[PDB]
Amino acid sequence: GRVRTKTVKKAARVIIEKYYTRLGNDFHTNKRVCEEIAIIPSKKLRNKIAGYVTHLMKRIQRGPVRGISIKLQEEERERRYVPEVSALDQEIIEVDPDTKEMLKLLDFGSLSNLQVTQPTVGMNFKTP
Amino acid sequence: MQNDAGEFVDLYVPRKCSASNRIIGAKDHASIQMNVAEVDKVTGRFNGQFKTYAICGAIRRMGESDDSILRLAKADGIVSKN
Amino acid sequence: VRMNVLADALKSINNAEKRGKRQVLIRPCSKVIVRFLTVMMKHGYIGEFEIIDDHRAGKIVVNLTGRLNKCGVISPRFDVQLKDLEKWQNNLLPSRQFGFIVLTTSAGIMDHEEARRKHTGGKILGFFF
Amino acid sequence: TKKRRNNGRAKKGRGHVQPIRCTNCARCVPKDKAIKKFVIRNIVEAAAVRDISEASVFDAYVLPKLYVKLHYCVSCAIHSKVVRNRSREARKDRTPPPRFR
Amino acid sequence: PLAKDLLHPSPEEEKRKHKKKRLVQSPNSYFMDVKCPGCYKITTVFSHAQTVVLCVGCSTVLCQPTGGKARLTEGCSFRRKQ
Amino acid sequence: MRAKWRKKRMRRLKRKRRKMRQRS
Amino acid sequence: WMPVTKLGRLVKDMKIKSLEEIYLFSLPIKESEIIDFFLGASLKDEVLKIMPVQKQTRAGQRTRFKAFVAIGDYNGHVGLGVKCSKEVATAIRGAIILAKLSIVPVRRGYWGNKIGKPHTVPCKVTGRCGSVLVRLIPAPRGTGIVSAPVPKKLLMMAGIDDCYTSARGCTATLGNFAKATFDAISKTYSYLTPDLWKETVFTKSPYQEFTDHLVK
Amino acid sequence: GKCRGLRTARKLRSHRRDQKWHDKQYKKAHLGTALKANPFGGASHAKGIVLEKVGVEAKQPNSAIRKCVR
Amino acid sequence: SGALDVLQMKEEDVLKFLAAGTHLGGTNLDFQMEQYIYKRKSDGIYIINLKRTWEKLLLAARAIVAIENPADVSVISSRNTGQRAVLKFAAATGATPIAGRFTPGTFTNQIQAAFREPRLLVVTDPRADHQPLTEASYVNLPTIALCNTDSPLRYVDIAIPCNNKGAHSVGLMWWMLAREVLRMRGTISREHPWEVMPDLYFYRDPEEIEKEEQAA
RNA sequence: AACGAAAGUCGGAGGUUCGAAGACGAUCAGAUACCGUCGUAGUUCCGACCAUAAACGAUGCCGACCGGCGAUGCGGCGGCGUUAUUCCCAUGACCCGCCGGGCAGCUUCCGGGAAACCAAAGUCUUUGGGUUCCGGGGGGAGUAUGGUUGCAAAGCUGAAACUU
Ligand SMILES: [Zn+2]
């Protein structure tokens, strides 16, 4: 089993929160990055840290990760909608007539952009 | 409270609820004090003066803070009279 | 069945006051309860009320600002002479500075400090504080 | 220790339910403390229905089912694993268990 | 609730309640007059009557005793008095 | 001892005692 | 002492000037150097009990020590904190921190003919925790505290000069008896007397007034 | 619920007169059978003549031979 | 609000409330929401009265502009249909957003790194977001909630009646709240339409963004 | 004072099955227990007795007050529709609500409680609506005696000495 333990995937994430301007997608660059940016004892931890920051940079640039901070949103405020006509600009709004009685008794409904539709017959809304 | 020389001898005078007039104690940690802002009558902008209401936490726990805020804002000219 | 109507009226006041409600509805309406709630109103404890007239024994709708910690009844109505008033106001009241015992005397229904000032005693009705 | 509020019964508001007898040990339980179970299967098994079907003189004869109404006592369900012991806080689940995926 | 007015009840909630549980109790029966269509006696019936109310022209039955309201015989004409 | 059988054994004891007391 | 709360930055600066502005708005006190800041020279504690409580395992028993501590400034102020930890000095230290965080003010009142300074609880108060129901009664001037020893410590610490007591229940378990007395004397500033009938004016909150100071 | 009216003093006192007998000290000191079976007869001390000297062993967690006299 | 005719409803706001489905409530009624329903249809849906929605929305906007600091009004959305509206409202007004998962202790655990202390709380839906509604009870927060007809009113102070279930009506209600706060505080004049469309606040489904990305 | 499961007792009729006591088999060191074969008294009915059960909601009765919710049994009232078929068809069967009474339910920081839990086992040291039987550490013991009821088995009333 090759599951990464707590230190090689917490330490890799605290390495990724700062120092994002140095990291990349290739493993052999980040492996050489990791000794200027940290004090790690011997290399098998450092190769495992480099493997997880390469896997995390493989993950992270196509969407949000839960564990990573809004330094991601600093990338999405650094790198990144409405329609032309709004979806609330429709020209006929169907209104079933209890709403029309409400609008008439709120001193509206003299103005007509709406169209009242026919009331339902049958009251079978419950489940058996 | 007030002894015969006229002195006010109490430590402090606690707030009372605006909905039930119960004494909001020192450790009624669910009680609120809410400011509701006034607006100017000609422009409809916030001009600096307030309305202040306090509700104790025991009224809030049974779901009755909303209706008392609606009644207290209705009676001081914030909610309309329909 | 229903006995001692004043007791069930004051338990209605107490249960609807402890929930912080603003108005109660009392049924039936004695002439005992209208003098009793006159006594509690004149001390500034309940405010105004209304006596709803059907042609039977009426109802009473009382306003409530909660100021009222406890409103109680004493049953049966024990005879309180004027030397037994201090033994009764030591038991039921929470303080020497406030609280009242209502007792029904030959000058009328009155509270316990007025009965010392009018120099009379009578049967006890209850208390409020 | 009150263990169950309904006492493991359906007797609410009457004095006596007439008893039935268990099908597995003939132990006389009341009608509603017993664990009722209604077992429907085909009369021929799932295995032998493939070669019953080559012997039928009738074309397209759907074989009947076996309708067995089983009552069970409370001892022989936990011996017979029909009904098993559950937690103190999931005893308030009286939805019947799922038979579907 | 909990600011609710008991002295001014709305008529939706005064026709809702049981007839003993209103502020002033008032009965849910009413007085009708049944007109028989082939005679000229206007005949006064209860709504909830318990006898078979016999008219005096053509001696027919106007109403039938049931557990609730009396079901009038079909084809007569009624209106509520007062 | 199950209390019904304690009851039954004092029942047998009292039945034998009232047997032995009414001979005379 | 670097503060972490908004109240702490208002208190380690001279923006809140007395403890009753913090009690007056029911602002929750969450760090114990505020009570060392305000009460200071007048805080004396006394340890009420150190009881061993034991948890059975397959490793034997695993024994803890559970300490009770009262604290107080003898005009108004009383706290009681319970902290259970594995070593006894650790339990006493944590109980002193929790006892500072639970300080409430006591409203003291008078007997009849009210000349002078207040000497008793204003009214008969009752507090209940566990099965112990501890009643505190107003007393005349100069009678002492007529009580059991465990609430005599709590009532002499709060600045109450005189009281009469009646207690029901299994009082020997000390935690409920001291917690019920603490519920009895934390309740005098919730009791609506006729002199507290006067209609309240509402003032600005500490976070509302000192909010352009605090954003720096 | 108790019987708590105004003319009911006889029911209350003839109740508490009879449920005092279920209290054990009142029954043991007021029925009179304890004073007849007690060897002193209500005295504080009694003078008597030593018949024989005994030793009795203690109850189960202790181990001793207690020296007593009959 | 206020019995003022400059603050009343216009037909443009009512056409937005009709077109979004704010007035179509649910099929059940918590018993202290029935002062907002007009009537129940043949379908089983309760109709939310829109004048009560507008007066509670303007009273909520009065409560939101009444804080001097805009940075300690905090907005919560845990369900997915209100996250984008909370982030757009927080970018518009200057509030602080909490979208997504709300880790408990963020109002009461002082040593955790996300410990905030806001002065008001606006939540999306008071049944699905009951964890900050309960954690508002230890920190003295008044709480504003966009409430459906079947939603419990425990621990909320200002209930804004709407259909908080759909995408359009949630995005519209947060848009109307942003518009009333920015008009009341003084940023936008009352007479022009606000230049931000409500489609900036609507929810974008993954199937909806993939159908928008493949054009014909 | 009336009724009071089952077992039981007496007189009569009935007896298919079950089935104490019992006779055999086999399991075990031993089982005069469970496990098989058969069976008396009984179970069944008509008269005359006996009055005990974990007769249990282990929760006296009457009245008041205090949050919600969705169904279910009965009676009543009001509402779009849908179905009779054999006369718009009669009246019933469904659908959405309301009121009263009832068996129960899920939820709730109303409140209580030692807690389990309870919308009562709530409104109770902020202690009194009315009224009936009953409990006072554990055993001794529901025993001894006395009384009375019963053909009998027994029932009700029913303590000490001593011990811890
Ligand atoms: Zn079985």
Q: Are strands C100-105 and C79-80 parallel, antiparallel or unpaired?
A: unpaired
D30 three-class SS: coil
The answer to whether residues I202 and I167 touch, using CB atoms and an 8 Å cutoff, is yes
The answer to whether residues B63 and I173 touch, using CB atoms and an 8 Å cutoff, is no
Check the CA dihedral I129-I131-I132-I136 and report its sign: positive
- List all residues 6 or more positions away from G129 whose beta carbon is below 8 Å from its beta carbon: G176, G179, G180, G183
Q: Give the integer Cα–Cα distance in Å for I122 and I136.
A: 11
Q: What is the DSSP string of G18-86?
A: STHHHHHTTPPP--THHHHHHTGGG-EEEEEEEEEEEEEETTEEEEEEEEEEEEEETTTEEEEEEEEES
Closest-CA residue to I122 (of I60, I175, I80, I182): I60
**Domain layout of chain D by residue ranges:** 1-101
Distance B64 CA to J109 C1' (A): 14
Closest-CA residue to C129 (of C102, C107, C105, C108): C102
Tokens of C1: 């069945």
The answer to whether residues I147 and I36 touch, using CB atoms and an 8 Å cutoff, is no
The answer to whether residues A9 and A53 touch, using CB atoms and an 8 Å cutoff, is no
Structurally, chain E folds into a number of domains equal to: 1
Closest-CA residue to I97 (of I131, I74, I120, I68): I74
Question: For chain A, how are helix, strand and coil distributed in percent, rounded to 5?
Answer: 40, 5, 55
Delimit the CATH 3.30.1490.10 region(s) of chain C: 69-129
Count Cα neighbours of G91 within 13 Å in the Cβ-side half-sphere: 21
Count of C-beta atoms within a 10 Å radius of residue A8: 20
Count of C-beta atoms within a 10 Å radius of residue E77: 11
Residue by residue, what is the 3-state secondary structure of I132-201? Answer: HHHHCCCCCCCEEEEECCCCCCCCCCEEEECCCCCHHHHHHHHHHHHHHHHHHHCCCCCCCCCCCCHHHC
What H or E segment, with its residue span, contains residue D61?
none
Q: Which chain J positions have some atom within 7 A of a protein CB?
A: 57-58, 60-71, 75-81, 90-91, 95-96, 98-100, 102-107, 109-111, 113-114, 116-118, 121-137, 141-145, 153-154, 160-162
Q: List residues of chain E with CB under 8 Å from any CB of chain B.
A: 1-3
Tokens of G171: 């009082």
Torsion of CA H48, H52, H58, H63, to 10 degrees: 140
Tell me the residue range of the domain where E2 lies.
1-82
Q: Give the integer Cα–Cα distance in Å for I95 and I134.
A: 21
Q: Give the integer Cα–Cα distance in Å for I133 and I127.
A: 9
Whether C95 CB is under 7 Å from strand J: no
- List all residues 6 or more positions away from A62 whose beta carbon is below 8 Å from its beta carbon: none
Query: Which residue among I15, I23, I168 places its CB closest to the CB of A99?
Result: I23
Closest-CA residue to G163 (of G181, G180, G145, G188): G145
H51 three-class SS: coil
- Which chains would you list as touching G if contact means 3+ CB atom pairs under 8 Å? B, C, I
Tokens of I76: 């919560």
C66 lies within 8 A of chain B by CB: yes
Q: What is the DSSP letter of D67?
A: E
Compute the C-alpha angle C23/C25/C26, nearest 5°.
130
Check the CA dihedral I22-I23-I25-I29 and report its sign: positive
Q: Is E7–C50 a contact, with Cβ atoms under 8 angstroms apart?
A: yes
The answer to whether residues B81 and I3 touch, using CB atoms and an 8 Å cutoff, is yes
Entry resolution in angstroms?
3.8
Q: Tell me the CATH architecture of domain C69-129.
A: 2-Layer Sandwich (3.30)
| Total residue length of chain E | 82
Q: Give the integer Cα–Cα distance in Å for G46 and G39.
A: 16
The answer to whether residues C66 and C45 touch, using CB atoms and an 8 Å cutoff, is no
The answer to whether residues E79 and E70 touch, using CB atoms and an 8 Å cutoff, is no
Q: Would the annotation count E76 as a binding residue?
A: no
Q: What is the DSSP letter of H57?
A: E
The conformational region for residue B12 under phi > 0 = left, psi -120 to 50 = alpha, else beta, is: beta
State phi, psi for C126 to the nearest 5 degrees. 155, -165
A11 three-class SS: helix
Check the CA dihedral H33-H38-H44-H49 and report its sign: positive
Closest-CA residue to A92 (of A108, A116, A118): A116
Residue I152: is the preceding peptide bond cis (ω within 30°)? no
Query: What CATH number is associated with residue E69?
Result: 2.20.25.100
Residue B14: is the preceding peptide bond cis (ω within 30°)? no
Q: What is the DSSP string of G112-177?
A: SS--SS--B-SS-EEEEETTEEEEEE---TT--EES-HHHHHHHHHTT---EEEEEES-TTSHHHH
In one-letter notation, the amino acid at residue G62 is R
Q: Would the annotation count E58 as a binding residue?
A: yes
Q: Give the integer Cα–Cα distance in Å for G131 and G62.
A: 28
Distance D66 CA to J6 C1' (A): 38
Tokens of E38: 């082939």
Tokens of B52: 């202040």
I108 three-class SS: coil
Whether F16 CB is under 7 Å from strand J: no
Q: Give the integer Cα–Cα distance in Å for C67 and G198.
A: 11
Q: Give the integer Cα–Cα distance in Å for D98 and A69.
A: 42
State phi, psi for B30 to the nearest 5 degrees. -105, 5
Q: Give the integer Cα–Cα distance in Å for G62 and G56.
A: 6
G134 three-class SS: strand
Tokens of B48: 């600096």
Tokens of C13: 């006041």
Where b means 16+ CB within 10 Å and e means fewer, I164-176 reads bbbbbbbbbbbbb
Tokens of A61: 């640039």
B48 three-class SS: strand
Q: Give the integer Cα–Cα distance in Å for G20 and B25.
A: 11
Beta partners for C49?
C62
Q: What is the DSSP letter of B74?
A: H
H34 three-class SS: helix
Closest-CA residue to I123 (of I165, I77, I156, I162): I77
What H or E segment, with its residue span, contains residue G141?
none
Method of determination? cryo-EM
The answer to whether residues C34 and C60 touch, using CB atoms and an 8 Å cutoff, is yes
In one-letter notation, the amino acid at residue B23 is I
I66 lies within 8 A of chain G by CB: no
Tokens of B30: 């669910």
Which fold does the domain C1-68 belong to in CATH? Ribosomal Protein S8; Chain: A, domain 1 (3.30.1370)
Tokens of E57: 């022209």
Task: Give how far Cα B42 sits from Cα of B47, G160, I10, Å.
Answer: 11, 57, 17
Continuous H helices in chain A: 6-17, 27-33, 43-60, 71-76, 97-104
